[PDB]
């Protein structure tokens, strides 16, 4: 089964499983960010972290756009980074609540704009973990969250 929400990849170029036509990440770390990520400079700490741990990264945020989404995608296409990004589900307080539920499910911490919750201060410990994540055009599924 696995927890599944109605939000798909923010880019088909995150697809790493041709035979499926979808994104499939094994033993991924999951960044839960209740905010819009537009600058990759802010993402570097987490990106360095997952790379050192040798695991791919799923990003679930209010939105991943602009330069951050572009840079992320090109580097994914080039095989330099192992990531997939999707929008958090819901709107208003529902978004926050669902992000927290996913956080609890995966043992992660929801990064935000609040003091001490900055994305640039995020560590491997703030990331949720799951056995596998599957993302297609319409949905994201988190399987066996720690």
Coordinates of C-alpha atoms in Angstrom, one line a residue:
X1 CA 0.0 0.0 0.0
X2 CA 2.1 2.9 1.3
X3 CA 1.0 6.5 1.9
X4 CA 0.1 8.1 -1.4
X5 CA -0.9 11.7 -2.2
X6 CA -2.1 13.3 -5.4
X7 CA 1.0 15.2 -6.5
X8 CA 3.4 14.0 -9.1
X9 CA 6.9 14.8 -10.1
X10 CA 7.6 18.5 -10.8
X11 CA 9.5 17.3 -13.8
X12 CA 9.4 14.1 -15.9
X13 CA 13.2 14.4 -16.1
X14 CA 13.4 13.1 -12.6
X15 CA 12.2 9.8 -14.0
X16 CA 14.9 7.2 -13.4
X17 CA 12.9 4.1 -14.3
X18 CA 12.3 3.9 -18.1
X19 CA 10.6 0.5 -18.0
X20 CA 8.0 2.2 -15.8
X21 CA 8.0 5.8 -16.9
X22 CA 8.1 7.0 -13.3
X23 CA 10.5 7.9 -10.5
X24 CA 11.5 5.1 -8.2
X25 CA 13.8 5.9 -5.2
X26 CA 15.1 3.1 -3.0
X27 CA 15.9 3.8 0.7
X28 CA 15.4 7.6 0.1
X29 CA 15.8 10.4 2.5
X30 CA 12.9 12.7 2.5
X31 CA 13.0 16.5 2.9
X32 CA 9.8 17.9 4.2
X33 CA 9.7 21.7 3.7
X34 CA 6.7 23.8 4.5
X35 CA 7.9 26.6 2.2
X36 CA 8.9 27.4 -1.4
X37 CA 12.4 26.3 -2.4
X38 CA 13.7 28.5 -5.2
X39 CA 17.4 28.8 -4.5
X40 CA 19.7 25.8 -4.7
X41 CA 22.3 27.4 -2.4
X42 CA 19.8 26.7 0.4
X43 CA 19.5 23.1 -0.6
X44 CA 23.2 22.3 -0.6
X45 CA 23.6 21.2 3.1
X46 CA 20.9 18.5 2.6
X47 CA 22.2 17.6 -0.8
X48 CA 25.7 17.1 0.5
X49 CA 24.3 15.1 3.4
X50 CA 22.3 12.6 1.4
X51 CA 25.2 12.2 -1.0
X52 CA 27.5 11.3 1.8
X53 CA 25.0 8.8 3.1
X54 CA 24.9 7.4 -0.4
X55 CA 21.1 7.7 -0.7
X56 CA 18.7 9.4 -3.1
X57 CA 16.5 12.3 -2.0
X58 CA 12.8 13.0 -2.3
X59 CA 11.8 16.6 -1.7
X60 CA 8.2 17.4 -0.7
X61 CA 7.8 21.2 -0.3
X62 CA 5.1 23.9 -0.7
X63 CA 6.9 24.2 -4.1
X64 CA 10.2 23.7 -5.7
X65 CA 10.6 26.3 -8.5
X66 CA 12.8 28.6 -10.4
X67 CA 16.6 28.1 -10.4
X68 CA 16.4 25.4 -7.7
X69 CA 14.1 23.3 -9.8
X70 CA 16.0 23.9 -12.9
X71 CA 19.5 23.2 -11.4
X72 CA 18.1 20.2 -9.6
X73 CA 16.6 18.8 -12.8
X74 CA 19.7 19.4 -15.1
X75 CA 22.0 17.8 -12.5
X76 CA 19.6 14.9 -12.2
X77 CA 19.6 14.4 -15.9
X78 CA 23.4 14.6 -15.8
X79 CA 23.5 12.0 -13.0
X80 CA 25.3 14.4 -10.6
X81 CA 22.4 14.4 -8.0
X82 CA 19.9 11.7 -7.1
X83 CA 16.7 13.6 -6.4
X84 CA 13.0 14.0 -7.2
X85 CA 10.8 16.9 -6.2
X86 CA 7.0 17.1 -5.7
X87 CA 4.7 19.7 -4.2
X88 CA 3.3 19.0 -0.7
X89 CA -0.4 18.0 -0.8
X90 CA -3.3 20.2 0.4
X91 CA -3.6 24.0 0.9
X92 CA -3.7 26.2 4.0
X93 CA -3.4 24.5 7.3
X94 CA -4.1 21.2 5.6
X95 CA -0.7 21.4 3.9
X96 CA 1.1 21.8 7.2
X97 CA -0.9 19.0 8.8
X98 CA -0.2 16.6 6.0
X99 CA 3.5 17.5 5.9
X100 CA 3.7 16.7 9.6
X101 CA 1.8 13.4 9.1
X102 CA 4.4 12.5 6.5
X103 CA 7.1 13.7 8.9
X104 CA 5.8 11.4 11.6
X105 CA 5.4 8.5 9.2
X106 CA 9.0 8.9 8.0
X107 CA 10.6 10.2 11.2
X108 CA 11.4 13.5 9.6
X109 CA 11.2 17.1 10.7
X110 CA 9.3 19.8 8.8
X111 CA 11.6 22.6 7.7
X112 CA 10.0 26.0 7.6
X113 CA 10.5 29.7 7.6
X114 CA 10.5 29.8 11.5
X115 CA 13.6 30.5 13.5
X116 CA 15.6 27.3 13.9
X117 CA 13.7 25.5 11.2
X118 CA 15.6 27.0 8.3
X119 CA 16.4 24.7 5.4
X120 CA 20.0 25.8 5.3
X121 CA 20.3 24.5 8.9
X122 CA 18.8 21.1 8.0
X123 CA 20.8 18.0 8.7
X124 CA 20.5 14.3 7.9
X125 CA 18.5 13.9 11.1
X126 CA 15.8 16.3 9.9
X127 CA 15.2 14.0 6.9
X128 CA 12.5 11.3 6.9
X129 CA 13.4 7.9 5.7
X130 CA 11.4 5.3 3.7
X131 CA 12.1 1.9 2.1
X132 CA 11.0 3.1 -1.3
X133 CA 9.2 6.0 -3.0
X134 CA 7.4 5.9 -6.3
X135 CA 6.4 9.1 -8.2
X136 CA 4.5 9.3 -11.5
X137 CA 2.8 12.1 -13.3
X138 CA -0.1 12.2 -10.7
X139 CA 1.0 10.7 -7.4
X140 CA 3.7 10.2 -4.9
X141 CA 3.8 7.0 -2.8
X142 CA 6.0 6.6 0.3
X143 CA 6.5 2.9 1.1
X144 CA 7.5 1.7 4.6
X145 CA 8.4 4.9 6.4
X146 CA 10.8 4.4 9.2

